[PDB]
């Protein structure tokens, strides 16, 4: 019965959801199926928990929060990532450029598939796991927030010495869920080009030059954990 949660086995063990929360997640999945019957929902069912199949909770090193999936078919189940056939979207392009500028060995890839990051323990978790085709934020009220917040809280409380990369107001809203005494929380503006302009009044550092990836690797090494090879993108 637990396999209906679509999560990998070790993830089901790690989260250790109560019967009530398991039923809540199953009801949400049935809602998604009933919506798929009449509308297109991104990503596919087998991709909602793609992050759980790309790596186990014991391998989590860096947690990068997204918002809702791409609403025009680019979504893969991971945050920011796109299929190897699709163009690199602007936010992911800015992420790749910051990597190019800050990491020496890194070279910008020709695609935006981040499955290699996910296999290394980079959790690219959207805070809302589904979206209706062509309608951004259409699933804001479905009820994905409790589940993704539960994942973040479980990583915070049951794991130690992870790095959380919170970009933009929506991702930073999840700061209270993370124990900043057990984990490193790096905060910056959203990587979108719309937030990179001068003459604004942001409260967080600019994304270009935030150096979050090198800082995350430094934190991981300082706590005797393997670093993330950000350059593996092909």
């Amino acid at each position: 019965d637990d396999r209906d949660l679509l999560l990998a086995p070790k993830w089901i063990s790690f989260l250790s959801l109560s019967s009530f929360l398991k039923q809540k997640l199953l009801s949400l999945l049935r809602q998604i199926r009933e919506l798929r019957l009449t509308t297109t929902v991104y990503p596919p069912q087998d991709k909602l928990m793609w992050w759980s199949h790309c790596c186990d909770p014991e391998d989590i090193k860096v947690v990068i929060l997204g918002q809702d999936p791409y609403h025009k078919g680019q979504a893969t189940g991971l945050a920011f990532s796109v299929d190897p056939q699709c163009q690199v979207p602007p936010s992911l392009r800015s992420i790749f450029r910051e990597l190019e500028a800050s990491v020496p060995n890194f070279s910008t890839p020709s695609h935006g598939c981040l499955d290699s990051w996910a296999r290394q323990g980079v959790l690219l978790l959207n805070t809302v796991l589904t979206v209706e085709k062509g309608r951004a934020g259409s699933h804001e009220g479905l009820g994905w927030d409790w589940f993704t917040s539960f994942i973040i809280s479980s990583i915070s409380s049951k794991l130690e010495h992870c790095v959380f990369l919170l970009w933009g107001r929506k991702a930073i809203d999840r700061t209270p869920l993370i124990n900043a005494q057990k984990h490193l929380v790096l905060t910056a503006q959203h990587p979108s080009p719309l937030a990179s302009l001068g003459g604004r009044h942001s409260r967080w550092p600019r994304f270009q030059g935030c150096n979050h990836f090198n800082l995350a690797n430094d934190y991981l090494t300082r706590h005797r954990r393997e670093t993330v090879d950000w350059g593996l993108l092909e």
Binding site: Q87, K170, P193, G199
Partner: protein
Amino acid sequence: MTLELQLKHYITNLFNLPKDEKWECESIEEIADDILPDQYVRLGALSNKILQTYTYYSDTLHESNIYPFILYYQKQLIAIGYIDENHDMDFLYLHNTIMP
């Protein structure tokens, strides 16, 4: 869709880009304080308010270093424009702004 096609028409004519090229869209929610000019955010009562942003991208848009965008505040159209080659925000439309 109609506003997207208007933005596409305007940009492709303004920068002499291919009219038939397919545009894709990335949508991101962010507070107006990080997106729009400072004094505009203050005078427009947009401080600490979430904007639904739409950024459009393509091959020629990438080669031109241009990011066309449309900004909404809930159901209110806020801005239509583009980030130019010099990383500046140029506005086709800005709410309650003449000649932005």
